[PDB]
């Protein structure tokens, strides 16, 4: 049908964009050792890998089930929903780390350059991935998540795993970015003092633009899905499978946007330019 072929092409384009952006980040890291040198790059690689897992593992099967209308892989999908929870939690979590990372590298630059040694970087990456695998697979294979294949998470599990995977990271990320805003606003006022002395809100707009882009893409992309994951199993005012499905796709769409907002440093740009040519 007209709508069906359109969903097919849009979903295929979304997957291809996710795969391309994230594989580009991973390649720009593996090829260039001056990108692997820092630690913030360690965290960005972790994020890119999580989103690439989202793509290749989780997204296409749901897209096929969306096109065909029936879930054909069958007993797989037990695994799939587990896979889903993992990849979609290694993404949000990773943002959290990167956010705290930037904060720790701006609120205490000396302590940061001293204490954040690649061992601490690996420990943070380990916490993210191991928290993901734990909180995802274990309640699935033990069938605590259950109250076409029903991916409908149990009423108690929805709120619990939701609180962790989203609401602990959104609280931490909002705290961090509002602190970074306080710091950047302070420094801008200070720099403005000197230039006004010499002469005797553009830089503010730049701060607003970058913080708003980051937090607003993350929230406007992920937040609806998680307030739904909250409200739906309790009440399932209520919504249908198609609407719940588009808000799911918003969740996996953020995994597509992550490269452009978190991997466009100038050196990343130039590495992409020398890669694609």
């Amino acid at each position: 049908f007209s709508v069906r072929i359109l969903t097919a092409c849009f979903l295929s384009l979304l997957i291809l964009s996710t795969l391309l952006g994230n594989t580009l980040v991973c390649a720009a890291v593996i090829r260039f050792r001056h990108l692997r040198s820092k630690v913030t790059n360690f965290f960005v690689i972790s994020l890119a890998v999580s989103d690439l897992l989202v793509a290749v593992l989780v997204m296409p099967w749901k897209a096929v089930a969306e096109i065909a209308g029936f879930w054909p892989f069958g007993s797989f999908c037990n695994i799939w929903v587990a896979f889903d929870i993992m990849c979609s939690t290694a993404s949000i979590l990773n943002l959290c780390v990167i956010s705290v990372d930037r904060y720790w590298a701006i609120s205490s630059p000396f302590r940061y350059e001293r204490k954040m040694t690649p061992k601490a970087a690996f420990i943070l990456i380990s916490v993210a991935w191991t928290l993901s695998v734990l909180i995802s697979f274990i309640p699935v294979q033990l069938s605590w998540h259950k109250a076409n294949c029903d991916s409908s998470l149990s009423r108690t599990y929805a709120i619990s795993s939701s609180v962790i995977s989203f609401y602990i990271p959104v609280a931490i990320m909002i705290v961090t970015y509002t602190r970074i805003y306080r710091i950047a606003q302070k420094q801008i006022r200070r720099i403005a003092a000197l230039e006004r002395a010499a002469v005797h809100f553009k830089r503010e707009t730049k701060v607003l633009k970058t913080l708003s882009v980051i937090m607003g893409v993350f929230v406007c992309c992920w937040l609806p899905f998680f307030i739904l994951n909250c409200i739906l199993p309790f009440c399932g005012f209520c919504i249908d499978s198609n609407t719940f499905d588009v808000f799911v796709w918003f969740g996996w769409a953020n995994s597509s946007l992550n490269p452009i907002i978190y991997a466009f440093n100038a050196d990343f740009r130039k590495a992409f330019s020398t890669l694609l040519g």
């Binding site: 930037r102 000396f110 970074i180 420094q187 720099i191 000197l194």
Partner: protein, 235 residues
């Protein structure tokens, strides 16, 4: 034979693990280049830091503030064409430019040298910490009233003391206006063409001043903060 291959391999191991501890040490030292005219306080500043803080005249000094190591170096035996040994310091955290504020006729030389340093092709991301040194001598000359700034800088006659000035307790408004005038002549250069890539942080210092470690510490910290901001496109 093969034994010598294992001895060479363990020699490589002892070397690489020494280089790993040395890498962490080198990674944590903030190199600061001391630059500036003669008849200034560079050698006295290095001498004082070696004295008052734990410090390793000589070209170098190594000192620690709050578990943060610094290595400040002043080059003394060169010519005046600093256009070529400067590229050995393209990665220093900051340049400490010292200016004899009490030398009313070598002050134009300091302004020209500051302009050439601030606009150097190999110092584009290097922020400069401006020490307007010898403030006590400046107060001596201003209260003495024998050499007035207007004879060398006629602009000083129409200059008005800024409304943001923070004089220390017990300072004649004439001295305050003089030292803030010198401050704004250098800030007019730092705020000129310059770039958004680096800034100049003036401080009034004397050779006997003891907080001249806290000033370099504070300002290295601000430079690093702003480097981390401009890295994430925030500032």
């Amino acid at each position: 034979q093969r034994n010598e291959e294992k001895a060479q391999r363990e020699a490589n191991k002892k070397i690489e693990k020494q280089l790993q501890k040395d890498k962490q040490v080198y990674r944590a030292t903030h190199r600061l280049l001391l630059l500036g005219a003669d008849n200034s306080g560079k050698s006295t500043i290095v001498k004082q830091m070696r004295i008052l803080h734990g410090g390793s005249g000589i070209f170098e000094t190594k000192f620690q503030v709050d578990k943060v190591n610094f290595h400040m170096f002043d080059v003394g035996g060169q010519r005046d064409e600093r256009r070529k040994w400067i590229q050995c310091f393209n990665d220093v955290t900051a340049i400490i430019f010292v200016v004899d504020s009490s030398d009313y006729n070598r002050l134009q030389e300091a302004l020209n040298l500051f302009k050439s340093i601030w606009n150097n092709r190999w110092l584009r991301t290097i922020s400069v910490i401006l020490f307007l040194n010898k403030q006590d001598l400046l107060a001596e000359k201003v209260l003495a009233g024998k050499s007035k700034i207007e004879d060398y800088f006629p602009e000083f006659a129409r200059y008005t003391t800024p409304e943001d000035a923070t004089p220390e307790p017990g300072e004649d408004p004439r001295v305050t206006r003089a030292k803030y005038f010198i401050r704004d002549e250098f800030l007019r250069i730092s705020t000129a063409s310059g770039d958004g890539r680096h800034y100049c942080y003036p401080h009034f210092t004397c050779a006997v001043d003891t907080e001249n470690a806290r000033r370099i510490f504070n300002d290295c910290r601000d430079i690093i903060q702003r480097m981390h901001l401009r890295q994430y496109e925030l500032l």
